[PDB]
Amino acid sequence: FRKRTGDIEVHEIAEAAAKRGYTDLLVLNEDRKKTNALTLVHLPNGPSFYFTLSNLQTAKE
Amino acid sequence: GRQIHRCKQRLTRLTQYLLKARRLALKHQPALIPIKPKQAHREASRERKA
Amino acid sequence: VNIIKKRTKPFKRHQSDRFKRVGESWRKPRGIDSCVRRRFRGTISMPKIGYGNNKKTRYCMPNGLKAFLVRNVSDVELLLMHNKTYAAEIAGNVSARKRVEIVEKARALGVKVTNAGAKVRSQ
Amino acid sequence: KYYPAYRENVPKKARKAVRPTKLRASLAPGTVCILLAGRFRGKRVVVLSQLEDTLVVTGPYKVNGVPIRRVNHRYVIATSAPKIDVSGVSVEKFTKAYFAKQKRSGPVKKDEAFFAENAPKNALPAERIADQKAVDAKLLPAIKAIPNMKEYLAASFALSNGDRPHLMKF
Amino acid sequence: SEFQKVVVIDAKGHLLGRLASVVAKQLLGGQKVVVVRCEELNISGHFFRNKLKYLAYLRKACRYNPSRGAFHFRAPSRIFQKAVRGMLPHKTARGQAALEHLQAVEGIPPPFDKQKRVVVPAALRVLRLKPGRKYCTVGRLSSEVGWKYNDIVAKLEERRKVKSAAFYQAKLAKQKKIASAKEASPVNQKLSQFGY
Amino acid sequence: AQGHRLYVKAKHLSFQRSKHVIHPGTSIVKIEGCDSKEEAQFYLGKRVCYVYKSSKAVRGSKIRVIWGTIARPHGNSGAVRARFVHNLPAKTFGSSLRVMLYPSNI
Amino acid sequence: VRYSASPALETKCAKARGAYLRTHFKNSREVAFTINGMSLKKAFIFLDNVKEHKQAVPFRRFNGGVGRTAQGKEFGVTQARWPVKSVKFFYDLLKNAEANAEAKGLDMDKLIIKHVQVNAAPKQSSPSHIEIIVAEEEEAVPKANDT
RNA sequence: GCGAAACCACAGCCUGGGGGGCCAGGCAAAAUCAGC
RNA sequence: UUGAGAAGCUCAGACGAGUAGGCAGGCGUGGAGGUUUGUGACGAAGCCUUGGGCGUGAGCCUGGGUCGAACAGCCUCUAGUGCAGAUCUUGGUGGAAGUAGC
RNA sequence: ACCAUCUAGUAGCUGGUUC
RNA sequence: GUACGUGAAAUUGCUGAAAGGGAAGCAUUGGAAAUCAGUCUUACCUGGGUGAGAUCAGUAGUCUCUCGAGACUAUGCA
């Protein structure tokens, strides 16, 4: 888990993450304190998928 | 002196608009896409049915 | 100047908590039989001009910028010279497309839009 | 560089112009004192000199483990414990920029730093550990002269049920 | 000058209405008061002074279901517990929470025999009363109104004293050893100049 | 635990009040060993608190604290009149406080 | 139909309902709040005793003039009675409560009554709406050892 | 098994003092039924 | 030094219960003319809300849910324009109660 | 006796009279 | 889903969390639980070098207005 800090973009993340032995790369994308979408890319050139999370439930609920 | 005061203040205020909207246009910022009530009430309807 | 409020609890019409016909908006009592009208101690207070707030820090949000209903894309343009004393509150019936274009331009004018996040999920 | 924008909210001419600040009379340089709050509370320390507002104090770091700190003169309880000689120590090396923090300063992180993390361990520099041995070496013999003083420092202060600070004397 | 978490107030020689006012404030102060030998409290005025002042209180009962009237308690402990019940706002939530911090018992139970027993110097009889005055003892009084347990406690307390007396001589013999050992430590006599 | 306790034990006594009107913005505090309104001039200005223990744990612990200071003496018996950043709850009558010895001037 | 209960998942649960039932409203309720939270087959053995006066159902809320019985103390309630018309209606429902898992293909011997609801109806008496939820007992898997 | 209606400011313990409510007291445990 | 909506701006003092009564400024509702290069199927009005904001107040602005075709601010004109009460009118629903009772 | 109609018979008066 | 557009209040049942020693109701000050908002996201400002041109050209043309004021099309980008 690596929280995104400051000014960095997804296309620059993927090339910066493939060089350290990583395979895929998820991005949880909240808005207004609810998580609504999820994108996962495939490194370094693989297909990138943009789902949207829905009917979200935690483990406590 | 009142009128020339305004023009110089609306020059400081129009330059700050171009010096900002140019930097703002060059950053990479998320896409404000609209939500649609007809197509989020359809999903919620067909979710529990599926 | 730091904003301040002389009161924070609004006024609540007498016995508008017991009865559901009587609404909570304030109405001055009209009978001299009243306990409240004679202002007996222990009863609720009243709206007076004493609780009027500062004539300079009035109408201000707790941040310090006053509000302004912008209902289209040329209503935020007037706020170009007033970005440090006004916050561009978008009106409620504005569509979720005409809204996303006020935000992208008010951001160029450095104007605080208070509820830019409505109907707009970002990706 | 810009013509001033809206609302000339220019401040008035402030009459407030602080003059020399002056500490108490009990805070003489070299007077053993009590330290009240923070991390090294209770540990009796000795002052080296008076700064503008704060003091520049240290416990003899061998005796207590207290480094050369600044302490605001209010969280110090002065004490009439016997004094020492601080003429041999050069306190003028310390200034208000000596104890200034090390300037976060945002050195360029080469934004990839989001992933890779490092740490300078913020280690005390070689200059701090060096003078700590130096200033202590030129006061340890001084408190060796006064009996019960080396062991006065290393102890702590702790009032007890059955004691009441106002009527007791410090 | 005491903020003990629990205080034990031995009550022999005290006045009732002055100890019940000292205690009533320390209950609301947050302490935990135990009043032992409540049976040997004193009241200004001669023997019949409070006697008709309490035989009058027996004539006072409700006139509806007389098992719902006033409960005239006869124990020496509850005589004084009554005294600390009107001194407190016992109809609030802070009164009835204060009253359960007070434990008023007669004699001395063994859970408080082996502890310190402080006294109040502002409520004592030998101070607050003129010499040669009329005073009545509660435990000697309430026996004549129904507290039928006088001859047992006077017997029980007599056994505790001689046991405590036996405890004292062993304690008294203890510090006579340290009385020698205190001056035998030579450092006391040349370093008494710190006041000690 | 006798190598600790750099404060003075106290007890929150009551709110400021008249017979019928209470003023919860300013408290009454009884310091231990302070038994005169001339002996209370030593504790004027000290920063008092009120430490307690909540059930739900936040930031790796459970102890919370309400700070404040001491403003006036109060009466002839050595009580004082304090003032807290948050007014003390009325269910803390007869509790225990701490009168921290700083800002110390002695 | 949109039901009132968060339970009744497709997984291990099934539902039936009964609307416009011409019984009383203050009489099927006390039955309903007694059978609630129980297993299914036990409730059948339970209510048939009500039909033969072998067990009375307590009247907790609408306890108007209900005479004391000897068997109301099995639950601690003073007053109880033996309604027969209302429990006749519940038997009709619980048949559909079975016969819906019998078509969904559940496990029948872990089946509890999860949520029974009794409402009012548009007055013509005091008619009733009833919906019922029967669900499996949501068992627990033992934890794997250590990590 | 069917099944009202009157009525409905909110209500429900006693003593004393200016009544159910005020002041000071006595006290105070659920939930109900039969006489009264 | 720009603070000329001179119906604005600015400086200083005193004052502040209020009955019958007198005066003044505003808030809100349905329609009418003008105006906003006005808002709206990417969701108008309404409705609900343990959300936020403003005004001393009448009130207004807004986030979320619901919903489905219209609607509002400003300047004027106009009135079938504001409800706690009338043993008030109509409608709906309660406690008494599964009691009285058949 | 009842039914419409003038009638929106009759107050010195009883209740109510809306930001 | 014809008990059918939107579906308020009274009022009823279930679920969740609380409170309740012969009165609640509300006002004020705060504790505990739940939860919400705040731009803080980043922005700002300061030199050199490298490249781009335009309102620059010891520069050539068009049009609309009024010598030059804007809009341009070249070409260089000194």
Tab-separated table of N, CA, C and O (backbone and C1' of nucleotides) in Angstrom, chain B residues 1-3 5-6 34-38 41, chain I residues 2-5 41-43 65-68:
chain	number	residue	atom	x	y	z
B	1	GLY	N	-8.088	60.538	-10.989
B	1	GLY	CA	-7.300	59.500	-10.357
B	1	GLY	C	-8.105	58.288	-9.946
B	1	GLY	O	-7.541	57.199	-9.808
B	2	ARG	N	-9.412	58.454	-9.749
B	2	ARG	CA	-10.257	57.312	-9.427
B	2	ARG	C	-10.339	56.344	-10.594
B	2	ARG	O	-10.232	55.128	-10.408
B	3	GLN	N	-10.520	56.865	-11.807
B	3	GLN	CA	-10.718	55.994	-12.958
B	3	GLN	C	-9.440	55.262	-13.328
B	3	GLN	O	-9.472	54.061	-13.613
B	5	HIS	N	-7.139	54.487	-11.357
B	5	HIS	CA	-6.941	53.487	-10.317
B	5	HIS	C	-7.634	52.183	-10.679
B	5	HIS	O	-7.084	51.100	-10.460
B	6	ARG	N	-8.842	52.268	-11.239
B	6	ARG	CA	-9.600	51.069	-11.583
B	6	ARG	C	-8.900	50.266	-12.667
B	6	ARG	O	-8.765	49.043	-12.560
B	34	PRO	N	-20.363	14.194	-15.462
B	34	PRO	CA	-21.663	14.299	-14.794
B	34	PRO	C	-22.221	12.950	-14.368
B	34	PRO	O	-22.091	11.947	-15.072
B	35	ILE	N	-22.857	12.941	-13.196
B	35	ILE	CA	-23.700	11.821	-12.805
B	35	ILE	C	-25.079	11.994	-13.438
B	35	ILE	O	-25.482	13.095	-13.826
B	36	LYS	N	-25.809	10.891	-13.564
B	36	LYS	CA	-27.096	10.972	-14.240
B	36	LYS	C	-28.139	10.182	-13.465
B	36	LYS	O	-28.001	8.965	-13.312
B	37	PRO	N	-29.192	10.827	-12.961
B	37	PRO	CA	-30.146	10.102	-12.112
B	37	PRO	C	-30.869	8.982	-12.829
B	37	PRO	O	-31.278	8.011	-12.182
B	38	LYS	N	-31.054	9.085	-14.142
B	38	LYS	CA	-31.769	8.041	-14.861
B	38	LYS	C	-30.949	6.773	-14.984
B	38	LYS	O	-31.522	5.689	-15.124
B	41	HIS	N	-30.330	5.121	-11.121
B	41	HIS	CA	-31.524	4.431	-10.665
B	41	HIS	C	-31.815	3.194	-11.493
B	41	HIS	O	-32.528	2.303	-11.026
I	2	U	P	-10.090	59.355	-0.743
I	2	U	O5'	-10.424	58.204	-1.784
I	2	U	C5'	-11.398	58.418	-2.784
I	2	U	C4'	-11.255	57.450	-3.929
I	2	U	C3'	-11.540	55.994	-3.630
I	2	U	O3'	-12.931	55.754	-3.536
I	2	U	C1'	-9.635	56.199	-5.036
I	3	G	P	-13.587	54.355	-3.955
I	3	G	O5'	-14.990	54.381	-3.209
I	3	G	C5'	-15.064	54.031	-1.834
I	3	G	C4'	-15.677	55.117	-0.986
I	3	G	C3'	-15.043	56.497	-1.111
I	3	G	O3'	-16.051	57.485	-0.898
I	3	G	C1'	-14.836	55.739	1.110
I	4	A	P	-15.957	58.936	-1.584
I	4	A	O5'	-17.149	58.945	-2.641
I	4	A	C5'	-18.470	58.641	-2.227
I	4	A	C4'	-19.497	58.981	-3.280
I	4	A	C3'	-19.695	57.973	-4.391
I	4	A	O3'	-20.444	56.849	-3.979
I	4	A	C1'	-19.657	60.144	-5.302
I	5	G	P	-20.464	55.495	-4.860
I	5	G	O5'	-21.998	55.067	-4.801
I	5	G	C5'	-22.986	55.980	-4.288
I	5	G	C4'	-24.183	56.028	-5.204
I	5	G	C3'	-25.524	56.147	-4.503
I	5	G	O3'	-26.516	56.619	-5.404
I	5	G	C1'	-25.308	53.982	-5.396
I	41	A	P	-31.162	19.645	-18.637
I	41	A	O5'	-31.546	18.109	-18.659
I	41	A	C5'	-32.881	17.694	-18.424
I	41	A	C4'	-32.997	16.196	-18.466
I	41	A	C3'	-32.684	15.558	-19.816
I	41	A	O3'	-32.067	14.293	-19.617
I	41	A	C1'	-34.880	15.012	-19.171
I	42	C	P	-30.551	14.071	-20.081
I	42	C	O5'	-29.848	13.442	-18.802
I	42	C	C5'	-30.131	13.941	-17.502
I	42	C	C4'	-28.876	14.306	-16.758
I	42	C	C3'	-28.782	15.763	-16.321
I	42	C	O3'	-28.092	15.825	-15.080
I	42	C	C1'	-26.950	15.245	-17.698
I	43	G	P	-28.740	16.594	-13.835
I	43	G	O5'	-30.287	16.667	-14.183
I	43	G	C5'	-30.926	17.920	-14.373
I	43	G	C4'	-32.375	17.871	-13.975
I	43	G	C3'	-32.637	17.418	-12.544
I	43	G	O3'	-33.809	18.061	-12.055
I	43	G	C1'	-33.688	15.940	-14.033
I	65	G	P	-27.804	11.161	-4.183
I	65	G	O5'	-29.159	10.648	-3.531
I	65	G	C5'	-29.187	9.450	-2.770
I	65	G	C4'	-30.527	9.241	-2.110
I	65	G	C3'	-31.726	9.195	-3.040
I	65	G	O3'	-31.909	7.921	-3.632
I	65	G	C1'	-32.190	10.639	-1.231
I	66	U	P	-32.569	7.791	-5.089
I	66	U	O5'	-34.050	8.321	-4.885
I	66	U	C5'	-35.007	7.554	-4.174
I	66	U	C4'	-36.294	8.317	-4.031
I	66	U	C3'	-36.965	8.714	-5.334
I	66	U	O3'	-37.770	7.676	-5.859
I	66	U	C1'	-36.863	10.579	-3.884
I	67	C	P	-37.747	7.341	-7.424
I	67	C	O5'	-38.666	8.459	-8.069
I	67	C	C5'	-39.946	8.757	-7.539
I	67	C	C4'	-40.345	10.159	-7.905
I	67	C	C3'	-40.292	10.476	-9.389
I	67	C	O3'	-41.513	10.157	-10.031
I	67	C	C1'	-39.118	12.134	-8.167
I	68	G	P	-41.538	9.306	-11.389
I	68	G	O5'	-42.175	10.321	-12.432
I	68	G	C5'	-43.138	11.279	-12.004
I	68	G	C4'	-42.811	12.671	-12.489
I	68	G	C3'	-42.829	12.856	-13.998
I	68	G	O3'	-43.170	14.206	-14.282
I	68	G	C1'	-40.663	13.284	-13.196
